[PDB]
Amino acid sequence: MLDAFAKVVAQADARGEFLTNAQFDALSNLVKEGNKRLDAVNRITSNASTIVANAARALFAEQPQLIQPGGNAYTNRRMAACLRDMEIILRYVTYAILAGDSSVLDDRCLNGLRETYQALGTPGSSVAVAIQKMKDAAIAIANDPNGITPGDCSALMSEIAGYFDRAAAAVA
Amino acid sequence: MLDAFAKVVAQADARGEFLTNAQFDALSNLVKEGNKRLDAVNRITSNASTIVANAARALFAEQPQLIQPGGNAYTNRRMAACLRDMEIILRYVTYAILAGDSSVLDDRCLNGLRETYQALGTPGSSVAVAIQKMKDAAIAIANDPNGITPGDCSALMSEIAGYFDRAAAAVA
Amino acid sequence: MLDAFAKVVAQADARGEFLTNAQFDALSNLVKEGNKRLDAVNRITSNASTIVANAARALFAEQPQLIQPGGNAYTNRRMAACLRDMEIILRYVTYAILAGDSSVLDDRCLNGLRETYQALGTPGSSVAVAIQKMKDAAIAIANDPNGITPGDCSALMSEIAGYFDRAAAAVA
Amino acid sequence: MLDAFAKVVAQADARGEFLTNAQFDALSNLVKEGNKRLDAVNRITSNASTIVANAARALFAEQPQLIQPGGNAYTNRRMAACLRDMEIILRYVTYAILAGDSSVLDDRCLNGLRETYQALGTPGSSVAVAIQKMKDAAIAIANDPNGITPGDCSALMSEIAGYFDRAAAAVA
Amino acid sequence: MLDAFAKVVAQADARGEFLTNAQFDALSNLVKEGNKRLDAVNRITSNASTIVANAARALFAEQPQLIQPGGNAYTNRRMAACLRDMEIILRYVTYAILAGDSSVLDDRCLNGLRETYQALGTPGSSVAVAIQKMKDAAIAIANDPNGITPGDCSALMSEIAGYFDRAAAAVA
Amino acid sequence: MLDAFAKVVAQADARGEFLTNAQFDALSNLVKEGNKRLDAVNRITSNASTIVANAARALFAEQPQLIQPGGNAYTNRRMAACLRDMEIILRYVTYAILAGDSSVLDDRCLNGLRETYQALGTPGSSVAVAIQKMKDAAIAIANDPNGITPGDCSALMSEIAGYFDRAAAAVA
Amino acid sequence: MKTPITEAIAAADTQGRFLSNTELQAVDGRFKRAVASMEAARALTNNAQSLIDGAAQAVYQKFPYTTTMQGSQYASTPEGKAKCARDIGYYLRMVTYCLVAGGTGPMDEYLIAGLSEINSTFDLSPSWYIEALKYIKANHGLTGQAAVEANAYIDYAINALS
Amino acid sequence: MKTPITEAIAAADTQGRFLSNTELQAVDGRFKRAVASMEAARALTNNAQSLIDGAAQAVYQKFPYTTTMQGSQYASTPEGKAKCARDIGYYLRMVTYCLVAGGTGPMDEYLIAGLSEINSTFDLSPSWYIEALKYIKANHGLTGQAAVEANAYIDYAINALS
Amino acid sequence: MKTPITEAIAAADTQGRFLSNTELQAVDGRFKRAVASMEAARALTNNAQSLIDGAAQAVYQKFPYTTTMQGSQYASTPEGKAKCARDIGYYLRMVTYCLVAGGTGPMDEYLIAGLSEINSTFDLSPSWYIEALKYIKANHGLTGQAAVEANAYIDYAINALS
Amino acid sequence: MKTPITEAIAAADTQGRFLSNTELQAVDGRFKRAVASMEAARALTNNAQSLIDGAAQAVYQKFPYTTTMQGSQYASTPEGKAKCARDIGYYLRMVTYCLVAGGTGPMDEYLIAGLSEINSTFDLSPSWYIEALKYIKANHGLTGQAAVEANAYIDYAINALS
Amino acid sequence: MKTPITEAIAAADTQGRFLSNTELQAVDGRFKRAVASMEAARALTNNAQSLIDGAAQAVYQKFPYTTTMQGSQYASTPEGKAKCARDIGYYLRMVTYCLVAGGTGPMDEYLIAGLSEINSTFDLSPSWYIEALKYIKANHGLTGQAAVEANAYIDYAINALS
Amino acid sequence: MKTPITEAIAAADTQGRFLSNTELQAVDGRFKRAVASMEAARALTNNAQSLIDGAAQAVYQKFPYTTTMQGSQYASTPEGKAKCARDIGYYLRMVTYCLVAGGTGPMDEYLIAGLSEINSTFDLSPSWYIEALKYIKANHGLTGQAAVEANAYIDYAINALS
Numbered sequence A, B, C, D, E, F: 001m002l003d004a005f006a007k008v009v010a011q012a013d014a015r016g017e018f019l020t021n022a023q024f025d026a027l028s029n030l031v032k033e034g035n036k037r038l039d040a041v042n043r044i045t046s047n048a049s050t051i052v053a054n055a056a057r058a059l060f061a062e063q064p065q066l067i068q069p070g071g072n073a074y075t076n077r078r079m080a081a082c083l084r085d086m087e088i089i090l091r092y093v094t095y096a097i098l099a100g101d102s103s104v105l106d107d108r109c110l111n112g113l114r115e116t117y118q119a120l121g122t123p124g125s126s127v128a129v130a131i132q133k134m135k136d137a138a139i140a141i142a143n144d145p146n147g148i149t150p151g152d153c154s155a156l157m158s159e160i161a162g163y164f165d166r167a168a169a170a171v172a
Numbered sequence G, H, I, J, K, L: 001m002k003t004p005i006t007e008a009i010a011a012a013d014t015q016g017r018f019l020s021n022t023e024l025q026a027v028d029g030r031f032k033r034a035v036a037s038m039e040a041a042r043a044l045t046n047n048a049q050s051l052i053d054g055a056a057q058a059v060y061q062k063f064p065y066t067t068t069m070q071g072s073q074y075a076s077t078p079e080g081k082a083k084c085a086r087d088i089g090y091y092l093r094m095v096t097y098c099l100v101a102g103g104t105g106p107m108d109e110y111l112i113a114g115l116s117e118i119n120s121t122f123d124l125s126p127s128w129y130i131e132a133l134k135y136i137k138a139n140h141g142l143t144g145q146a147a148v149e150a151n152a153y154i155d156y157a158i159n160a161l162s
Ligand SMILES: CCC1=C(C)/C(=C/C2=NC(=C\c3[nH]c(/C=C4\NC(=O)[C@H](C)[C@H]4CC)c(C)c3CCC(=O)O)/C(CCC(=O)O)=C2C)NC1=O
Pocket: D032, D033, D034, D035, D036, D037, D038, D039, D040, D042, D142, D143, D144, D145, D148, D149, D150, D151, D152, D153, G033, G144, G145, G148, H021, H024, H025, H028
């Protein structure tokens, strides 16, 4: 996997080039915005259980056929697996927030996941809905103005939203 | 794998339903016919070696090209493997007789077996003939009226014939 | 794998036949030419490092894009792997010289190697060129008239050339 | 492992002897008492959780130093392991009740268990006390006259007590 | 393994106690001296090869019987293993410098190492001499006043010397 | 393991010495006697089954308590293991004949074998007797003057006897 | 799914053997016991509704705070009460399935796998379901070996929750 | 040793579980069958000597060359005949052990393991022992489920030799 | 025990490497953060008793049935109340240990391993301990990065119970 | 297939090495021995028919019951005699293949693998084939190292049957 | 690629955990150090050409035989000198990449993997590249923590060549 | 140690087999070649001193900087020259051992294992030892198959250094 810094390095090596000043400048701003990134990870991680449970509750309220007998989330084994998947997707999204790059998410979570759910008969569009609900809770928690030095985190919330939408697109 | 009882249960759970009286009645008759099923398994199993050897003898008598040099049953390694396969198919058929359901046969023996023989160059239609010969011997042994409380086992012999024909169809 | 002797045996067994006099004669000449075969292996093997290094030098001189940044042999990991591959192909070719048959080369080296290089993005035609250069050095070394009982090794050099051309065709 | 029947067989084979009538008679009474044995296993097993939890509660009430900081059952990892051990000993004792012989208990549970606890610093005499408490609860449950065909199970309760005392001696 | 901080915690938990002010104060000074510790590790690590090679050179100069035919460091396999051991001991000593505690050194390097060398016939006292030579070079490098903010590192050099002497005692 | 040639080399390397003329001469005679050694191996190996079976027959004739019920060779599993052991010892002895040195026998067969039989309750002195009987048959077969170029193999038969006596001493 | 019959087969199949008399006796044991099991399963099925309604109330009686406390995990709304009744019926239905199949298989696969993860996640107390199960056990009205049968699987669930 | 009881335990132990009703039904199956098995074992034990003497002769009748041909593997000496009778008694004794234990275990451990290595090594023909076993089967004089029981283990030996 | 320092070492040791600059930056990160962590740990330690007493009452307020219901798992006896206070102090003490060590290690080893087995066995509800932990979080009185630090480990316990 | 040449290669390939002088000496050993082997193979091939006919009769002489006893495993019909002659020719043909290849490979792959399963299944006695092989050995008429060569592979078959 | 950030993630991912405060402190350590690293990387990049030209000459000065001796491995032709300058620039470029990424990753992946195989194959002496690296180290002109940073990765290369 | 004889044994032992004719031909190959090998080994041993002295000078001639440059790795002191002569004699001695044993074994075990680690650590250039070895090869004065033999093992060392 790559972080934001290693990605610039790998692109540079392919051309056999030292970094430019534009690239150094871009990477410096990445470092100057680092405190915000650490808060976002800390906050989303610190509320991981409620994000999952509350999103799952909402999903089953809107799609009751999932929990009816014969549904894909009926039985405790299937429910456990469903909640587990939500936890995993969230986990890998937080990894990508820390690294500032989606490679870890794409490579270790999303590659082949659509195919996985198709073989099982798990409705991918239902999974997408679960991810979208976790997204909306995560951004509300991460971007909460209470209990933190005030400032603008909007470009980071855009980036965070980017990682969630990528995962929802990957399964749907 | 499922037995006859677990199959009714799994169908019921998919609908979220308690068993009906029709289902209870059907399962009770299954139990009342259980002594016959145990005799059939005991008898076929107790004669396993002669069933195999006698069927193989017959097969090679009718299809000599199998044992000619260059034939698929020429050499002791290939002959051993051929007899082994006949033993295995018989074994799994007896498993399905005991359970009253083909799942164990289908899942652990027959799935992918046609493809296996096609990759090897083993003639599937010759295998089918070997199975049909074991079938005819097995039913004669299982349904022999000597040395047993008289009664009607015809519906069970139908079922037994069903498992053999399924295996012969699976390879041909 | 087969050597030249085991191949004649396997063809014979498929027909269920004792060897003919023609086959015995052919195999006797194989044995009478055995000293030449052992020299060829000894000589090619004894110069294995220079064959590889000198062929690689030549390849990178003619195809500099391979070693430019972004090239498939740029970075020491990729260079190492490239030289390793050349060593491996040479090794397996020498195995086939000893055995008098290509089965070991085909089975353990060449099968699936085109597909391997296509998945990686390694240019197969560049690999072919590397093999052709090792071929030309190997035959010059093996067929050097200095320091050895004089005699004709031309049919063996044809055979050796055959194994190299087979490998170059397999990747291109 | 041996059951009561296999033990008589193994003793007989060592002498090369057919069973006597005394041995056949002894084994027949074993079978005639089998319903009682099945009740005892069913009852002890059906109450497995309360036997363990209630014995552990009692142990920690009488030996508080076990749960004080620095005690061998302080921390949840050590408590879990302690309760686990109690469950295991109970499990293996029930195995021996079913088989009518201690071999499974001795061989798979007790062999080397004193040495295990000595290396860890776990007080063996405390473990013995835990087993003795499970024993007293198990016999009260197994020998409860409510809800069962009346009759005498005293020789079986002696045997059950035998298996518990053996385990307590093995660790102390 | 423990670091200096986890060791205080583990001692505290055994008594079931919150940390005192004395312990908090001690741990604060540990943190305030942290820059010095990081320099020492960086410096010793950055010169790892010369420390080893120069110590080994010296050892073989003073104990030539080690490299004479039949000596324990004669042959390249035995020499390689000898140099490897020196590298390993150095590595684990640097781990303990970073952690501020010997547990990692004791547990993963030194436990059983005397016994290891006795079974092999490797002279432990020669190993001790090699360690003592690495110690003297390491402290000279780590405590070099050139190219660094001036200040007193004497208590840290004492600690570093402590880890080397511990390893030399462990093998001798 | 060592052969006779590698043993001289290893002794030489320990002193850091080129071979003397005495050593070269000794090794030359080893080579000149090589045809005899190959006959001895070929002959003993070619009669391996009768050596074992005939020795075992004799052993059980002289020590009937081994095959009585409760005996260490009673039951087919124990008999099989007994015959297997005899085959193994013979096999490893033939390895040492080929190599001209006992290292392979000592290292891979005899080390720890006394301890093995003591833990099992297998009478080592009975095993010794079995080996002595195989020895006497092996030398009679190997030194049979019929069907071979006449000459003196007495020093080789001494050596062969040496390997058998070593194995018998190792278990007794 | 785990039954006496699939266990007998699994054993043989694992060791690459035909069925033996060892395994046939096991399956006969199951066929003979089936009469007591089917009696139990039938009675529990016929009386299902009253047993579920009675059991839910037993729970509300023992833990009254479950009908008053705010939160989706509790039965203080119509929705919460309906979910509670549903779950209790699931438990009862699984017991009837065990009785029919002659083993724990159905409960093992459909209820017990994942159970502690579910209860932990949705804040469902095991002791609620134990109380429900103890009510069914005390009030199923079965006697003799039918009671032994039904109680064996009910108590199996209880140990899974304990 | 393989019995219905040790199999029931092995299953539970392998999965780290207490015994369940799944396994208790298996052992009850064994206890109920024991009456037929013990009848068979007793009758075979009481009539052992005549069955062994009859069986050996059946073998000599079928394969007369075994009483004439030179070699220690054959019964053409007093010693050879005594070894033959011994072996046949071993077979019969193993059948009675199976009957008593309720499974193949005793025969599996004491006779079948190593069998083909023994017969191959000492040049003993399996078909000699099959004939001996077929005689016992035809002439044990048991009826009903006692015969079913004894025949199951005799035929088990026959398949092991085939 | 898991700290930023033992993690840095484990990484290097696993790959057979000396420490690199990769790992030294990690440990410097820990040394700089230690000032905020030690502030948090000190304040929580000095105010331990009031935080424990306040937290227990928060639990009794939220779940009043814990002070009334019969059973050794509840706080309806002096013994039960003392066990409850003890446990809550254990939680707080573990948080101070995490703060001091710069990682989850102490809580991971001494509290979280085995937790769900303990709570299941003694019938202890996780939601009791969550409420206790939320009280400490709301009332520790820390600000800035000391609060961030203490809250990180408190919330870590909460997710372990959820 | 196992020959001195494929063994030399397998060794090198297993250790990822080029061929060395270690392995070239092995193959030269094979080339020099080939003269004795080819002599043996040629003579056995030219005299194949008389050796097969003689060998079958040797078997019928030693075991006369094979020509009289009813059953498809015996040579008491034209079909049985033809199958017997066929098998004996298979044995001889395999020996000539070993001689040509310089190793056991051909016999190992085409005859010995599965042998004991075949003989056990069709009730074929190993001692029949040993007698056939001993006849060929006594009457092949080879001398010197050609006899050593042919006898090595014949005796190899005998140990496989023993 | 190995950085303080991917290491923090790998640790968590390996144990199936969310990121903890353990790992966040590690990444903060990296962010704070980045100022010294970027200073070093920028200065080395801006002065790259003079450092490469100076370093190559340092090598030719120390090992004069490299400019005189015949062979493609040496710098006694224009082509050889250009290859030498290229390689030295590769080394310097890798150091700047390490500085930017905050770890050894870039050098580990693009230069050190395969290094000893390359040097062995093309007859390139490690001590040439050590001398080049020592020149850069003595003459980069950085001070304070920027020098510490650049020297850490230069010395890392030196140990890889030693 | 790797010889044609231990290889023949290892093969058999690995597959649990007795030695076959496959393996005996390999060992005969070795016995026949031994005459050429022993001739080579004897001549190299008798002329050892002149070959070592000549070879060291060949190295000093090719790489004159080795006699002038300061450092313990070079031969610019009496001690350095004595170490160089020692090493060259080690190489020659290993070749004679290979010749005697009939394989690479002695060189593999005593010289090649660890070689690249040693040369890397003490800054010893492989090309020094290649030049020494090429001198011995050109000037050993052997002809025919004795030269083939000695050259095979010398060239083996060269590829190990390349
Ligand atoms: C699925 C496993 C299984 C069980 C659990 C089982 C139990 C079982 N135990 C029985 C009887 C019995 N059970 C007991 C046992 C006891 N009575 C007492 O008063 C003692 C306190 C207690 C000690 C255990 C007695 C005395 C009998 C009657 C005698 C007998 O049939 O053995 C019976 C006979 C029918 C009946 O009496 O109701 C059965 C079916 N059978 C099975 O197949």
